[PDB]
Symmetry: C2
Subunit: 315 residues, 2 copies
């Protein structure tokens, strides 16, 4: 069944994982080193064993593909995956004259109404970003995010390299290249910043007139993360394939540390007693071929009949 | 037997490989995506099924570890793996007033005496590098090599980051880090240069008080390359383990494109009918713990009883 390499990872982490005290200790089971393959000709590897929001995914991949870094795009799509980040830096100094929130991702988890403060304060911020150009520009731009380092790497000599656009230029002239590699890792930014990338490095490849893609992800959350990630890059594999006129091969997900957090073993345990269903067909716009000029309504997904989504808390 | 994951790779490439016209077409069998593990507590994964020069390896890793980039070190150790590179750039313009050699790695393969010209000319160059400070400085320094981008990455603001030395600083304070990553890939240099790295990215990890290491190599030569590479990084895993006071775990070799060139199928076929022997024990100096201050005579290897080495031509 298409998503089984998923399910197998978590079976592995569960009974082969190691405990690491490593958060704020908190706990994890973690394996170092794992490839996993998906044949993208069988289906779209959106997990059927719990409902996953494909639109939070195809929006987030369209931000990346537009070279975007400002929050505002996403919040114009009901997409709240990046908020936390920007809001933190908002609640840092100035206009911010309101209720401090150090460790709000904990005080707002070990709360009751420390949740409503944050959730009004965030209601607020998200609205500031939405309408105050002025504001948006300053706080909603996160600056170093994936779309930034995919499409505009700052080079020592002053320019900006569209690292993806050039690799897409070599798929079409040099399909047999062994260097079709985009990095999001920058040695010097890496230690200043909040979130050194998980989705560290990717290489494409061509044979048989089909595109296969390989991701090196450095840290992973089996429960809450990996189901969403499989789809971002399985979609990337389909639109680059789509634009370079080739067919979709395979998506290979390689992990350095994979880990399940301890508060997720319950859910992941229950998910596992379910039985994967025939997976959705992905299907994109022929009349449109400009992928950096794609919008929402041109990637369509059909026949995703999941099981119920499982709520879990993030750790 | 310790080196079997090797042997299995080539069995895979051989009967699962694809033909790619991709050199100067010339031919290869190539797979995209492969992890491979070595438990470094069983032995040192220096192939027993053909003689491999461990000293060409432990010298080359000491150049890297000294932040070195000049050829001269290596040529002071009978180490000719990097020559070709430097010599090419020598035979580019000036003092060079001698027999052009465009495509000498072919004219000097599809030759007879076009070999003696090169091999006197190179005798010569190597000697220039050896004794002419002046010269060495200019031609024997290759500039962007692994030791350069491990220990002195040029950052946009003017400094040089000792990316390895800092990660070795975090093994000892932050052993449970999920970011123990050194890159040799630089987005902007990458397209100017000759040889964009194969040994692209590496991450270390700690559990159980033992160090395991993971390499992402982007292109690989199963026959002539991979046996030498397994040892460079299996040695790195032992000396970092050695200096951070921890034990040696495992070495995980992940490959994007693995490939065997067509002129190597014979040899690799014959190697495979051999039967791997108990592997050598690696053993390093206790009194010395400064690994960047290591020299040759402090890494010792014992009990390597290989089969005969198999000569093959490079393609």
């Amino acid at each position: 069944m298409l998503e089984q390499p998923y399910l197998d990872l978590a079976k592995k982490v569960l009974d082969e994982g190691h405990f690491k005290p490593d958060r704020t200790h908190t706990g994890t089971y973690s394996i170092f080193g794992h490839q996993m393959r998906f044949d993208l000709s069988k289906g779209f590897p959106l997990l059927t064993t719990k409902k996953v929001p494909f639109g939070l995914i195809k929006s987030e991949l369209l931000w990346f593909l537009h070279g975007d870094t400002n929050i505002r795009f996403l919040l114009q799509h009901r997409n709240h995956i990046w908020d936390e980040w920007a809001f933190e830096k908002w609640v840092k100094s100035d206009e911010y004259h309101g209720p401090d929130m150090t460790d709000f991702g904990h005080r707002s988890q070990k709360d009751p109404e420390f949740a409503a403060v944050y959730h009004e304060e965030m209601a607020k911020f998200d609205d500031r970003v939405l309408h105050d150009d002025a504001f948006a520009a300053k706080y909603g731009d996160l600056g170093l995010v994936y779309g930034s380092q995919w499409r505009a790497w700052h080079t020592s000599k002053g320019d900006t390299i569209d690292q993806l656009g050039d690799v897409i230029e070599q798929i079409k002239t040099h399909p047999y290249s062994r260097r079709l590699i985009v990095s999001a890792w920058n040695p010097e930014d890496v230690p200043t910043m909040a979130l050194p990338p998980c989705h560290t490095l990717y290489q494409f490849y061509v044979n048989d007139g089909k595109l296969s893609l390989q991701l090196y992800q450095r840290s992973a959350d089996i429960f809450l993360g990996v189901p969403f990630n499989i789809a971002s890059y399985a979609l990337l594999t389909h639109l680059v394939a789509h634009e370079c006129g080739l067919e979709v091969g395979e998506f290979i997900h390689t992990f350095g540390d994979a880990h399940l957090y301890v508060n997720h073993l319950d859910q992941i345990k229950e998910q596992l007693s379910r039985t994967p269903r025939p997976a959705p067909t992905l299907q994109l716009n022929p009349d449109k071929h400009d992928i950096f000029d794609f919008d929402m309504k041109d990637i369509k997904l059909l026949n995703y009949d999941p099981y119920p989504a499982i709520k879990a808390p993030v750790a």
